[PDB]
Design a protein around this ligand. Structure first.
Ligand SMILES: C[S@@+](CC[C@H](N)C(=O)[O-])C[C@H]1O[C@@H](n2cnc3c(N)ncnc32)[C@H](O)[C@@H]1O
Lengths: 98, 107, 94, 328, 87, 98, 82, 106, 94
DNA sequence: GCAGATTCTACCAAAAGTGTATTTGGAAACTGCTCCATCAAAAGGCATGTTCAGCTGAATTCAGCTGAACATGCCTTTTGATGGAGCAGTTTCCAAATACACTTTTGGTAGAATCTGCAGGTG
DNA sequence: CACCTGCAGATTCTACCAAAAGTGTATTTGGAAACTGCTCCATCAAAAGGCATGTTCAGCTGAATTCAGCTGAACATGCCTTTTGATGGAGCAGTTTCCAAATACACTTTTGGTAGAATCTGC
């Protein structure tokens, strides 16, 4: 049985997703997370569907860009595997936790 | 009669821009040349982004500019990338870019 | 209530640069956000500028300085020429 | 007294006074002495063997004695090579093209002797045509290699500065003629002294050059519209001359005959040229454009890579516009 | 209006494969097992912050519906300007 | 001949400079640098004295905070020595390079 | 002995900045890198300050021109007016 | 006549805040309570920082607040530090802080 | 020409909070910068709030929402109570 | 001991507060109508959970060599004193910006109709 | 990846028009322009406090080596998101009424800022 070596498919996935633009988090699950969080802030809120899509476009752009920085932090440490400490260093330098 | 846009040789609406400047509460007064100059700049920046986005669309064998083309245009252009450095273009995706050390083999 | 957008003007310019190229509604929405965004940025820089100089008037001179403060190198140069040209022409026509 | 470095061919030796004249804070007579000696060592195997004698690599720029023991070793070594050259070994040929490291050095030597005060040329306020010319060696080499020069061609440098680009092209490639025109009086005046000095120094080193003229004129003028059209290789330096000037130069590349190539540091039209329904004023209706590779080792003072852009006159662009308009 | 199901633990709807995909778009080739929970925690903070401001705009306007514009303005305030939704 | 080990004095200096607030670049050289840069944007300018001082207070606070991020990057790579690649990583994540 | 102005930002001055920044050991290459970074910082802030100077038709850069420049660059400074 | 500040029980100048709001081109109109509310907010924030700054002067055995004390008060306070996260207090210095890995191995 | 600042009011507050504590010139200038900075942020946020809602008036309500958007948690809560208290007190006075 | 903060007298345009009359933004009131929440049903795109082992991260060891500490010596910076380059305060005056009444042009947009780029599947 | 079919999204017209935008007198005034006084900036001299440079070696960086076990790849299974539709109605948003509160002067009062003189005090 044929097997690509570890990393081969990962690289293929990188090329595929960097070529496309569709959102990567499932839509309904993201909508529920938005509603759950909003509900804890204020009860009985309604949402325009484009308000939830706007939050999703912004959340995914934010996460993709944070993973780029995280990746640079792992590579800086001579690793190719991102780890919680890379995300933390990236957020600290960005002033998100500084 | 003639529009202030025609007198200035512009496609963008000088009248509209003058109005928006007044309603925006930017200053007590707005001179006549302000909206002309501003409409001209907005028109120029939009010409620049559409020039590059239409080229990205052509590069991708498409006739219709979509958000991805606006993003490729902006991100592949040093100055537009900086001007929009803190802006997210919805459905824009990102530029293909794989860090070298992550590629296989050697040499 | 009528809601304005720069759409028809963006379209006119699109036709000048790329005659046979169209634009999707989502891209046009992005272009409308872009124009509003830069308008606000330039207008706000102009406002502060005038206030800093105790002037109650925003003239093309404040727009020009705001443009220089806001735009990167080559874009500022070209924007400046286009605006200057538009005003000189405007003032010659009346 | 003085320090003398004698010619390998027995042209006329180069004399450097003592005390050493300084041209600027980065170029002095001493550093020219050291550079000559390295490059002559590289051309003549035997010379370098004779530079092995006595003390070597303990000379320093300033100190009469330290530079005189090097000069004196060189002058003896030249004599020996001249006696040898009467024999089985023959003179350094003047049909041999120069190598890139050697060519760079010949222009550097020449430069210092024409321009006795380059800092003054470097004071310019950005955004005007007075902005002093000259380009890095690497860029000019990129042009020479990629855009072939043939002996059915004519080379012209609009905004040549001290004319070192023209000179470099003329020693390295042949053409019918090679020219430099420069507007601002000070760098152009120097351009004449460069043309003469360059010719003296090419013989001195025993290497081949073509035929060239550096001319003092104004490249932002009516006469030069015709010069450009009957020319087929235009190098033009611009970027920091202002949009106003970019328009007027563009108009003059418009006058150019089909086939003509323009090498510039200015993208006169987009790379990917698309039609406009008002390209009756835009230069791109008559040229294919592609951007040449940025070269690192030629950074500015903002630390930006300098590019050149290859534009080729092709009227097919124009022919297609017109046909689309004839339709319907 | 009768009932309305309780919302809980929806952060788990941000699955391991979705996070892997987002990291791939971000150019990531290998991922430690601890990254998934860390990313959920970071996304929750991001969302709480933007949603808090967006809802603040909603309440100020005395509306009960969070609009795309309330989100656009909230994003802009946070230095995350978003184009494409009226903003 | 007494001799402190490598690092002992470095640590001593960190403690000393983190306790004080005086500027650490000498004034005149900073002023010359400022004037030279400004001359490229507009010739024959004068500077109020407070203008140069504000530029120095801002420039020093910028470099000191950048050194803090640089230090976290070197430490992230298991080093205690800052290197150019650490400053570059920090600037890229801050978005000054990005 | 001459001296390039940016070189006036000396190794010792840079080390002190680094110390206040908590830095214990420094690579020799750090000094030039720092100078380059500082020049870019000053070019960006001074360019804007001078833009405000010129707009005001002045020949003197004021603290306020600098404060406004720093503020628009997201580097708000307290203590010099504004 | 009683000053608007006294009526509001404030030390900060309501009248001046109203004037600054009007001429700042923030809106065509400015209601009566706006400058009062805003002045009160500015007063409160001022009291908060001076309160912590004064405490820092005290801990340092000083009776006069200098920039250093304002910096220590702000950077040691989670909320003030975030409010002033992009602000530089001239002559403030930084908080004493050495990364643990840099300390000698006692 | 008059140069206004918040110096005298900052000083009155200092005396309420630390009666026997003084403040240097540089520190006071920092406090003046602080007050002007917060004033501008709050005012700008209130300005945007009214424009977003197409209102010509900045009232205590826009100031309140601006405060909740700009200040961190506890600071916002106390600022809001202080502001509400002052407008109450003010409104109840011949 | 002293640079810088504090106390005090005197001057006054600038503000700020009070009084009067007019103007108006936007709240309540009623309501048209978009679009949000929600239930339904179907199904396949994906999430989940597992197996297996490639190769990565983490540990350990070690030697070259780069930076830290430091002693040695002078040149660039800091400090204090002095003509003017202009930053500002004042006065004059018009080009140009509100304010206001019509008159005309135009960008939206509601509704129905036909077009056309390319998503999506295939080989 | 070029070719080819079905379709949602897009560019194609008709008619209505209030909101724009523009054309035309009257009235108002912001700020360019010129002259000028008062700062405070540039520059020079000299009293003053680091910095540049070469030597020595401690200990750090990074190379080489090893391996436990994490994490990627592939796979089986089937859940739940997605898609297509419909519907009640919450509530957003349009329209008219109309006062509480804001703008708009005009006038009286107080007040914060500035300038100069001189004593006081934290550090
Ligand atoms: C950037 S400099 C050229 C430097 C040199 N050509 C090089 O490549 O290094 C441009 C030159 O263009 C010249 N120039 C501008 N307009 C010109 C004109 N109309 N005729 C001749 N020379 C002109 C200027 O005087 C200026 O020296």
């Amino acid at each position: 049985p044929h097997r690509y070596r570890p990393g081969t498919v990962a690289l293929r996935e990188i090329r595929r997703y960097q070529k496309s633009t569709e959102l990567l988090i499932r839509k309904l699950p993201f909508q529920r997370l938005v509603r759950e969080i909003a509900q804890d802030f204020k009860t009985d809120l309604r949402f325009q569907s484009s308000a939830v899509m706007a939050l999703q476009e912004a959340s995914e752009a934010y996460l993709v860009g944070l993973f780029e920085d995280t990746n640079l932090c792992a590579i800086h440490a001579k690793r190719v595997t991102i780890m919680p400490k890379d995300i933390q260093l990236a957020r600290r330098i960005r002033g998100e936790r500084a | 009669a003639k529009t202030r846009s025609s007198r200035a040789g512009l496609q963008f609406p000088v009248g509209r821009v003058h109005r928006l400047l007044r309603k925006g509460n930017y200053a007590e007064r707005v001179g006549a040349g302000a909206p002309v100059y501003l409409a001209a700049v907005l028109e120029y920046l939009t010409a620049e982004i559409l020039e590059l986005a239409g080229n990205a669309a052509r590069d991708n064998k498409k006739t219709r500019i979509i958000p991805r083309h606006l993003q490729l245009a902006v991100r592949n252009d040093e100055e537009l990338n900086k001007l929009l450095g803190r802006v997210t273009i919805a459905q824009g995706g990102v530029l293909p870019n794989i860090q070298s050390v992550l590629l296989p083999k050697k040499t | 209530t009528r809601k304005e957008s720069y759409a028809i003007y963006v379209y006119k310019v699109l036709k000048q640069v790329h005659p046979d190229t169209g634009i999707s509604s989502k891209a046009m929405s992005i272009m409308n956000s872009f124009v509003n965004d830069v308008f606000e940025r330039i207008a706000g820089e102009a406002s502060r500028l005038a206030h800093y100089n105790k002037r109650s008037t925003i003239t093309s001179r404040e727009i020009q300085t705001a443009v220089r403060l806001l735009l990167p190198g080559e874009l500022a140069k070209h924007a400046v020429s286009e605006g200057t040209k538009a005003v000189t022409k405007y003032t010659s026509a009346k | 007294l003085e320090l003398r470095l004698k010619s390998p061919v027995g042209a006329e030796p180069a004399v450097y006074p003592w005390p050493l004249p300084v041209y600027d804070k980065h170029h002095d007579a001493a550093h020219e002495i050291i550079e000559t000696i390295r490059w002559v060592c590289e051309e003549i195997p035997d010379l370098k063997l004779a530079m092995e004698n006595y003390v070597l690599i303990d000379y320093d720029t300033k100190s009469f004695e330290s530079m005189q023991r090097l000069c004196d070793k060189y002058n003896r070594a030249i004599d020996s090579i001249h006696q040898l050259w009467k024999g089985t070994t023959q003179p350094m040929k003047l049909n041999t093209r120069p190598s890139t490291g050697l060519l760079r050095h010949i222009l550097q030597q020449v430069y210092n002797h024409s321009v006795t005060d380059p800092e003054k040329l470097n004071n310019y306020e950005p955004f005007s045509p007075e902005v002093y010319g000259e380009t890095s060696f690497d860029l000019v080499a990129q042009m020479i290699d990629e855009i072939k020069m043939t002996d059915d061609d004519l080379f012209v440098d609009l905004g040549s500065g001290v004319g070192q680009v023209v000179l470099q092209v003329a020693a390295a490639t042949n053409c019918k003629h090679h020219y430099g025109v420069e507007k601002a009086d000070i760098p152009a005046k120097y351009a004449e002294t460069m043309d003469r000095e360059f010719r003296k120094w090419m013989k001195w080193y025993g290497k081949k050059h073509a035929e060239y003229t550096l001319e003092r004129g104004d490249f932002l003028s009516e006469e030069w519209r015709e010069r450009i059209a009957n020319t087929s290789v235009i190098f033009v330096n611009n970027f920091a001359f202002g949009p106003e000037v970019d328009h007027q130069l563009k108009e003059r590349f418009a006058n150019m005959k089909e086939g003509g190539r323009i090498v510039s540091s200015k993208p006169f039209a987009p790379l990917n040229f698309r039609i406009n329904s008002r390209n009756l004023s835009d230069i791109g209706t008559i040229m294919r454009v592609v951007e040449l590779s940025p070269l690192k080792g030629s950074v500015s003072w903002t630390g930006k890579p300098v590019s050149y852009y290859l534009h080729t006159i092709d009227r097919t662009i124009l022919e297609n516009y017109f046909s689309s308009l004839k339709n319907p | 209006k009768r009932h309305r199901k309780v919302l809980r633990d929806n952060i788990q709807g941000i699955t391991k494969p979705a996070i892997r995909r987002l990291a791939r778009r971000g150019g990531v080739k290998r991922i430690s097992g601890l990254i998934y929970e860390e990313t959920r925690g970071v996304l929750k903070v991001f969302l709480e912050n933007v949603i808090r401001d967006a809802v603040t705009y909603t309440e100020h306007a005395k509306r009960k519906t969070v609009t795309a514009m309330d989100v656009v303005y909230a994003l802009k305030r946070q230095g995350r300007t978003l184009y494409g939704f009226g903003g």
